């Protein structure tokens, strides 16, 4: 077969929000050409096998003469450069030893994000509407975990919860449900915290009807850095409160397999209706009509010029000119091959999600999900554990702190013994404007890497921002005929 | 209700997306496959056939990961008219192993088809295709066509069996619930 020479759509990066726009371009009959430079899907959202992902570790360890004069060239990136302060540690002999874990490698899938699905919210509503969702299966969260003075412990998630707590008094439990009641339709009573808009959450829950052991909870545990104004504290207990319930009893699922699924959903909905697809092959730069300023077309790899209207590229492919001025964040990442639960109980298949406070002002807070086996991304016998937190320092230094409190390197004596660890620092470009980049023809538009929220929210908006743009007046992501 | 994942791999053009069709439809055309299901009899039980198509993924090669997970049985498709195709077989066959990474990969049940036996100018002889799914395990070998209808309801059914040991036995190992669907 051979590379139509030209294309309503090129998307660059098979990453989570390209794929959406990808899915959703084609979805409504424009001709898409999807490619990634990698030989596998997914770009920084990808999971991986355990061999897989240390082939992935390696990495971060002329067209000219086709350009007519009335044209300029803007070169992309020939290297990627969004990941930073690789370091892997194996404690384990080099009951379960590394040959054990490189035989079963198969059986990880191991993300390079760690997120949960909220029952209710702009994913979940985009996979059921589209009917992208009959293209993965997922898992409950099953327990919110927190720790109680150096002691991980589950917390109350549920009214049976409240009430079968032995570890809050009845006052306490009147004030929560009084104050929980509240949150869930606090929009509705704007004098209630209208004096407290300008403040931080945590200031305005100093001045409820309810203890600082309550507050903390709330705070931490329910809305989930520490400045966030206390509207933003609402919308955030109140949106947990109402997922609560929907498919099990915490707001969150996983998908099985992990992460790394979702984009490749979003590209199968884009290749259904037509779109093409090229993994293994990259693109040189893209071509510019001197006069318009518009882009025209793109030269990839091969040498083929090919033509399209709109050209989409997550922010990697950008070259480093093309992004001099912008401003990137980081995101400080650990991934933890563990022997057992940070909360040991009977039933072992618990899928749990475990926040952790900056211990002093500084840092950020951390997120520890808990995967078990059934949750398809590790082999029997382990447990695959994910940190993450907006980064301070290198994520080894932001991180391993947490990991020496949950988790023994060594085979001889409590703790679950950590048996692998990787960390990593992964570029977060998240809400950049086109502005802080040069040059950016109007018709090329920027899909940015993984954000550090929980969900997906910021995926899913770029997506559909970009999609009014290119398909204006047309539905986003309406399900099959 | 059992429900078996089967997948059609193989060359683009050899007659996979309209072999799914002609099989689950009972229609062959001269712009939107995904996946069909449809409720069939295996040894007098009945079970829902699932069969996943490529949704064109594998004209540059780029089926990913997800796609192969939890096949059941994996259909493998060439032209008789085109020994190009043919000879590509070992490449799918061995790319399912790495994608799919199923359980005792060496009994896990592969089906060929030799599709288009209605065009005239075959140049890929039975005897030949019989001999490669010999040496591949005994692989079930069945030559169809898509066209005419040919063949092709009966190589489903043995696919369909296949399918179903392959899942009994995954489902015999399986010690966790089942997942959630939204
Ligand atoms: N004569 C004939 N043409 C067939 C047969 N099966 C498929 N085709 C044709 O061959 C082309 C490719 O078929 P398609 O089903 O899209 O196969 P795919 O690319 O493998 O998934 C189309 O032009 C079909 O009409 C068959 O049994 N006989
Ligand atoms: C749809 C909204 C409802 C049902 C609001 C009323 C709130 C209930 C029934 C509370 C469920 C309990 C929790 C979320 C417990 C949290 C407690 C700690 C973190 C100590
Ligand atoms: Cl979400
Ligand atoms: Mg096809």
């Not at chain 1, 360890?61 to 020939?78: F, V």
């Not at chain 1, 403040?199 to 001045?207: G, Q, R, V």
């Not at chain 2, 039980?45 to 994996?74: H, K, N, P």
């Amino acid at each position: 077969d051979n590379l139509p020479s030209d294309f309503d759509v090129i998307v660059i990066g098979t990453g989570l929000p390209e794929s959406i726009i990808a899915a959703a371009c084609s979805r409504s009959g424009q001709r898409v050409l999807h490619v990634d430079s990698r030989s596998y899907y997914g770009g920084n959202w990808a999971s991986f096998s355990f061999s897989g992902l240390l082939s992935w570790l390696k990495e971060y360890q002329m067209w000219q003469e086709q350009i007519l004069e009335n044209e300029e060239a803007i070169p992309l990136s020939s290297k990627d450069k969004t990941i930073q302060h690789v370091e892997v540690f194996c404690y384990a002999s080099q009951r379960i030893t590394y040959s054990q874990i490189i035989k079963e490698g198969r059986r990880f899938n191991i993300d390079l994000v760690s997120k949960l699905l909220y029952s209710r919210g702009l994913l979940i509503d985009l996979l059921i509407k589209s009917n992208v969702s009959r293209y993965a299966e997922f898992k409950n969260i099953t327990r919110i975990l927190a720790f109680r003075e150096g002691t991980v412990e589950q917390v109350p998630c549920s009214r049976a919860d409240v009430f079968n707590s032995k570890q809050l008094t009845m006052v306490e439990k009147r004030m929560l449900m009084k104050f929980l009641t509240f949150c869930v339709e606090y929009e509705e009573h704007p004098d209630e915290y209208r004096a407290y808009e300008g403040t931080t959450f945590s200031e305005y829950l100093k001045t409820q009807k309810l203890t600082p052991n309550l507050q903390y909870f709330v705070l931490h545990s329910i809305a989930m850095e520490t400045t966030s104004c206390t509207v933003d504290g609402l919308k955030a207990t109140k949106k947990f409160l109402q997922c609560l319930g929907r498919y099990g009893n915490t707001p969150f699922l996983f998908p099985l397999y992990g992460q790394g699924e979702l984009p490749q959903c979003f590209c199968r909905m884009c290749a259904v209706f037509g779109g093409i697809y090229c993994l293994r092959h990259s693109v040189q730069c893209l071509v510019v009509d001197k006069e318009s300023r518009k882009c025209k077309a793109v030269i990839d790899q091969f040498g083929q010029r090919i033509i399209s209207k709109h050209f989409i590229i997550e922010d990697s492919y950008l070259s480093e000119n093309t992004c001099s001025r912008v401003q990137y964040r980081q995101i400080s990442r650990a991934v933890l091959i563990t022997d057992g639960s940070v909360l040991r109980t009977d039933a072992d298949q618990q899928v749990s999600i475990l926040t952790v406070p900056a211990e002093e002002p500084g840092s950020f807070a951390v997120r520890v999900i808990e995967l078990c086996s059934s949750t398809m991304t590790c082999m029997k016998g382990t447990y695959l554990v994910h940190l993450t937190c907006m980064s301070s320092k290198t994520a080894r230094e932001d991180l391993e702190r947490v990991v020496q409190k949950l988790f023994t390197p060594y085979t001889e004596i409590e703790k679950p013994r950590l048996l692998w660890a990787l960390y990593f620092n992964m570029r977060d470009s998240s809400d950049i404007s086109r502005d802080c980049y040069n040059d950016l023809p109007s018709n090329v538009y920027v899909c940015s890497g993984p954000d550090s929220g929980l969900g997906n929210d910021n995926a899913v908006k770029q997506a559909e921002t970009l999609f009014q743009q290119i398909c204006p007046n047309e539905d986003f992501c309406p399900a099959p005929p | 209700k059992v429900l078996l994942k089967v997948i059609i791999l193989g060359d683009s053009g050899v007659g996979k997306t309209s072999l799914m069709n002609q099989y689950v439809n009972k229609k062959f055309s001269n712009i939107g496959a995904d996946f069909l299901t449809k409720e069939v009899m295996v040894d007098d039980r009945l079970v829902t056939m699932q069969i996943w198509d490529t949704a064109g993924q594998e004209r540059f090669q780029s089926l990913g990961v997800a796609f192969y997970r939890g096949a059941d049985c994996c259909v493998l498709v060439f032209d008789v008219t085109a020994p190009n195709t043919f000879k590509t077989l070992d490449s799918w066959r061995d790319e399912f192993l790495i994608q799919a990474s199923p359980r005792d990969p060496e009994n896990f049940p592969f089906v060929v088809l030799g599709n288009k036996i209605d065009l005239e100018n075959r140049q890929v002889a039975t005897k030949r295709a019989q001999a490669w799914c010999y040496s591949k395990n005994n692989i079930p070998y069945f030559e169809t066509s898509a066209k005419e209808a040919i063949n092709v309801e009966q190589a489903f059914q043995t696919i369909a069996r296949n399918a179903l040991k392959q899942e009994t036995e995954v489902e015999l190992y399986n010690e966790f619930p089942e997942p959630i669907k939204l």
